[PDB]
Symmetry: C3
Subunit: 286 residues, 3 copies
């Protein structure tokens, strides 16, 4: 094609009125395939067995829970922010994560494009196409998919991440993926639980654990503006919850996105919002 | 000496009429010692036990087979393309690969020169000298070698790589070491055998495997010019062979050279030619 | 603060007349925390169980021996070469290395400052504070320390590294940490002991081992000026000792400093002096 390395001249067309191929129930193309690799490293870290996929004319969404059933994951890729998107209607698919694990891990910088196709022809087949433009090499995966495991709680977890319900969480801040990784990797060296504490007002955010007669650790954020922290905790009121380290380390080590928004409420539930390009990743740990 | 790091001022003299030292049956010197490290990483990947060495007044050749006896390796370093070469006559040596494994792995960028000396004085000793010019440090290895294991098939494998016999292979193309590594690493994630298929004419090269009800994988090269593919397969004739992944991954992971020429024939035999600087590496898998 | 990354504007004030906080028996601050990480990688490589710490109004010193009891380590950080130092008197502390192992390993480039505080308030607590200036994040470790294990030989090992006793060692040279690592890693591939030999006069330094009928290895330094070698061995006199590889590889792999001074005497005792910035590291292997 056009090479200097191949110069990537891709157009972000978004949602199309009709597919290129007539039997396509879904046509997806994206110029950032590493998004899918990091997403499924996250699914691997969570030891998720099955990935629920919902395709609508506007976006595709991947649902999953971790093995310990504590964390819920909702990853939606917006069709208007990708290079090519069409979906005929609302249909669902089920993918075994172990089957596609190595396929997603095979994504490297030699692939400038990922294509996903589902056809009425093969109702139990999902096509994944990775394209190497340096040598015009097309790598096509034929993945056998099933009709979805119902999991009716997804109707309640998609409501839990609504913006009406989100702007009432009293404590929120932002970490880079590097910062979230460092905090919860260092914490995992000594503890499985960490206390998150914040006094009402302009006091620092505190993360700490205490072990008598050996080691106590306290990490304190003395400038709330530098982590985009906002708090609605009443003055002279103490916000204090304990959260598990394991699932947060799984998301942090996956490095799925650039920045990560952390939202906390008083009964211990956290929400992690990791938005990058076309991918909006939400983690609900209850 | 002359340093800015030491400025390497080495001369490629080639073959000499007589050695520097009088008792030298073989004097070899080369300014690219990493060639030998990658060559013996390959020998290690193949689990080769013994390396057969033939020294002639024109070149030195290393023979070996893999543990499964499927692959044959012929690596010859041309005396006219190295910095210093002399050999009195045609003689053979045998090296235990396990004995010299760590020695070759010790080669790094601090060594700007490898020297190999065999003397009539010590008929069962092979000298390997690595020189660090930053501190004038000379690292000398005294390796005990044996008289060679006969292996008479080498007379038939050196004939098999003749250019008369090579230009009749109907299917050939070229991969970079990175491309050959990616193809056969990704293949090894799901299969032990891959089908190589090519229809006569200007059709794409196809590599694929099929597993019912789980995963099928197909990688297709839509531009034969971009992989230097040439085919003599008759029009409307189908070339189709199955090849083992393991031994090819061993060569690809060794990253011995820059480019790799792949030659296929209809009964499944492959030949890999990897030529870099003074080293010509041939892999015959039958 | 002042950011372009945060521009580090730290002052090296040295020793202060009185602490900032009134109850501080020791106040230590340093703008090179990676020194402590490499120091405790060394302590980990030696499998040291307990670290003896002596704090004086002029400097802080860390003592330890390796598990095999062959090597002694004396690491002193000079208070006049750090950013902030005060100590009320001469007192001693004991630290369990396993307890603080992960804490020191958590030091990365996101921390521009390490602070160590001991208070009369908490006599069995040592505070370690790492500061991330990008987000004003303060990571405080509360380490439980004990009153020191007496180990009276430290009075004899601190005398052994006196400059009066050091300038009589007949053989000394200097390696970069990369060179010391390469020599004793390559040696560890084939041997547990290496012979160090030097003939009196301007002859090369020799390091070698010999194994009959398999492999002999000889590394020779043909330019003594390039490794800053000085010898007081009488002419036509042979200096020859055998030294263990393990403990030297532990120091070399730790990469604690830039250069390393090696001192040898005729009864096999070695001394390694590794001085970097505020840290002076001495290794005595008897």
């Amino acid at each position: 094609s056009m090479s200097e390395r191949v110069v990537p001249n891709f157009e972000r067309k978004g949602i199309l009125e009709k597919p290129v191929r007539p039997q396509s129930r879904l046509e997806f193309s994206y110029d950032n395939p590493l998004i899918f690799k990091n997403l499924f490293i996250y699914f691997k870290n969570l030891k998720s067995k099955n990935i629920l996929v919902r395709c609508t004319p506007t976006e595709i969404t991947f649902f999953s829970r971790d093995q310990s059933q504590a964390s819920f994951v909702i990853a939606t890729i917006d069709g208007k922010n990708v290079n090519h998107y069409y979906a005929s209607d609302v249909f669902w698919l089920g993918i075994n994560r172990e089957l596609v694990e190595k396929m997603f891990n095979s994504i490297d910088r030699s692939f400038l494009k990922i294509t996903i196709v589902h056809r009425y022809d093969k109702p139990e087949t999902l096509f994944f196409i990775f394209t190497d433009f340096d040598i015009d090499k097309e790598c096509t995966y034929q993945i056998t998919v099933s009709e979805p495991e119902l999991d009716m709680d997804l109707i309640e977890m998609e409501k839990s991440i609504s913006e009406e319900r989100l702007k009432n969480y009293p404590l929120r801040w932002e970490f880079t993926s590097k910062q979230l990784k460092k905090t919860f990797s260092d914490l995992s060296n000594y503890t499985e639980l960490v206390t998150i504490e914040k006094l009402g007002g302009d006091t620092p955010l505190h993360l700490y654990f205490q072990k008598f007669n050996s080691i106590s650790y306290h990490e304190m954020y003395k400038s709330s503006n530098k982590i985009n922290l906002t708090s609605t905790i009443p003055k002279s009121q103490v916000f204090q919850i304990n959260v598990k380290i394991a699932h947060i380390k799984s998301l942090a080590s996956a490095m799925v996105t650039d920045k990560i928004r952390i939202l906390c409420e008083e009964n211990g539930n956290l929400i992690f919002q990791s938005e990058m390009d076309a991918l909006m990743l939400n983690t609900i740990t209850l």
